[model samples]
Target: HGYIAKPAPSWKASKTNNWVVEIEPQWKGGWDESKGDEGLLATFKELAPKNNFKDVRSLMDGNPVFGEECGFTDPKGKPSEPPSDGTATFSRGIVHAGPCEIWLDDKMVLQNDDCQSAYGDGTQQTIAVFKPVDYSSCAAGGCMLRFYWLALQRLKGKTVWQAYKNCIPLTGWSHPQ
Candidate 1:
């Protein structure tokens, strides 16, 4: 129901644009929880595979723990292997994102039907979107997106400087991670 406009940037430049950013549903300011609304689940009736809701379910089902010092651990309390650790002192990448918006040309695409996610224990709050880079067509753009993350005190708080610092570059790997 709600999301951040600038999409909080991305580590990889490619993920900042085109693709939709999906964060899990929670009580946070920007996040909007369904609360089992009458017709809510009806919207996601179709199956999109693990990348979308599947990924969200996987993270929640595992009940991961997140923090910089404690870091993220599985239900068994084992360390989790995530992408990158922008916030070194806090739980870094065991969990990804929750509820977020999908951007295209810098504008929210597929409005109204924005996807919402389930709450994570904050173990892995962020993740990068991977897509083939081809800015040529999007260059003439209405709103092509590009940015990165750099958070220092992720759990304690977030700031412009922190968000900008954790920026990681995106790359096109022949195989998926």
Candidate 2:
């Protein structure tokens, strides 16, 4: 249950100062580690029709990716620079252990089987940037850097699929490859 904070997600500049409100409220669960444990409290199924989850497009195919949810007209102001160190850090140390992937539009740049297990649980989570990111695929105009993380947490009598995603408008510095 985490989102991109380093690049300054669009929702980060909202007037309301709210982060998760724009998210699918239906994603109900309990992540209180102190009290106990629970999780993305939604029915196990690909959200359709009102599919905020499984969103690839910028609100793509009518699904809200980087839209009003983060901010009204401006999502987080200007895309922040990708770490020169060739890495990415999430807003928070990923508490969920699941598949977390990064893409430059259609080109997938990185993938992790489990965010916590593979990338390590820390505020400074790093996604070893792939070589020759090949930004030429986007042509002159850069594309949305889509971030996808699916939390697969099993419960007592059920399980859940919480798709936490965001589309950061990233610009390639003279096309990496």
Candidate 3:
């Protein structure tokens, strides 16, 4: 019922011009619980590369250890954690999840909404959103990355990002991790 579709604003436009992107996945009869999670992962994979994001991993540093009970698991149906190469540690400070979250680099780029009480109904659609923060190195001019993705809800769909790589209005560094 709520969303902000506009591109993230320039850093100077507002002290904390954090742009937010919301994605709500509609549940149809064709997917089971595992399949549902898999679908979610698949979308992230696509979104990562398109967005210049390299390592995609679950946020596990401070998450609840409830495992699947809390919706935090990898494709293998086990508790999710950083990869052996230490790649899963991305998205260290995101403020939301199912205990279910996948990160792009060192920030909360995406997350699941099922863990929250409002979206607890398994039959109802769940929402995931991306909220962009200022690049750690940028202290001026506000170089903003154009955030774009497919907002699919009911069925399997591809996630999109890079199509608008050159779309940001400000001049600053945006290295997708």
Candidate 4:
């Protein structure tokens, strides 16, 4: 139930800018949920061949709507221009411990093994430091910065594999100075 909170993903921003949530003309985002600039609290379940991907690009494969593409669309599509510092940071809240990866286009700019609990308990929370790669790969087509984390847990002696993904488009890039 963790998600990126900064440079808000379209999924989260849309929770404020786009449409309302829940149903039947009942409750909306504000109640029981933080209404603006939020990411989805969900899990991924897949096995074998279908789950296998050569890289982050294929790891990005999914249906166009209500899926991976949703995180790359507009308003939410508004891009983040990486600073000249050669590095960028992202923030998130993860209650569990696992590995996290931040990918820009086909390049993985940041990867951490401990994620939330980098030092002690993975309970320290996330405000991750990452190298923002060159924008050249997307200059001709498009660009997106994606966060990937694989969380593992043992429930009743069974291991749970959960993945969280959120993507934000880029309007700028940087090099280490």
Best by TM-score: 2
TM-score of 2: 0.54
lDDT of 3 by residue, 1-177 (tens): 111123222222222212222323222222223344445445545445445543213322222331121121111222122122222221113222222333222344433442222223333244323333333332243332322222223334432111101122323334433
Span of 10 residues, lowest total lDDT, candidate 3: 66-75
Better of 2 and 3 by lDDT: 2
Q: Could you give candidate 2's per-residue lDDT for residues 1-177 as a string of tens digits?
A: 456654445644442322322232233443322121222322323233444544333232344432333232143357655554456666555555545676776677776555566565433354322232344444446566667655655455344445565667755555544
For residue 38, model 2's alpha carbon misses the true position, in angstroms, by 16
Each candidate's TM vs. the true structure? 0.21, 0.54, 0.24, 0.51
* Strongest candidate by lDDT: 2
Ranking by lDDT: 2, 4, 3, 1
TM-score of 3: 0.24
The predicted structure with the larger lDDT, 2 or 4, is: 2
Model 2 stretches with alpha carbons more than 4 Å out? 12-77, 122-140, 174-177
Clash number for every model? 27, 7, 3, 4
RMSD of 3: 16.0
- What tens-digit string does per-residue lDDT give for candidate 1 at 15-133? 22221222232212211222232223332333233225432222232343211211111112222222242211222221322222222333332212212232223344453232222
Total colliding residue pairs, candidate 1? 27
| Pairs clashing within candidate 3 | 26-153, 54-177, 91-107
TM-score-best of 2 and 3: 2
Q: What lDDT tens digits, residue by residue, belong to model 4 across residues 57-165?
A: 3443562322444342343456765444655454534555545676766677666654655422334354454544444554444467776655545444334444456
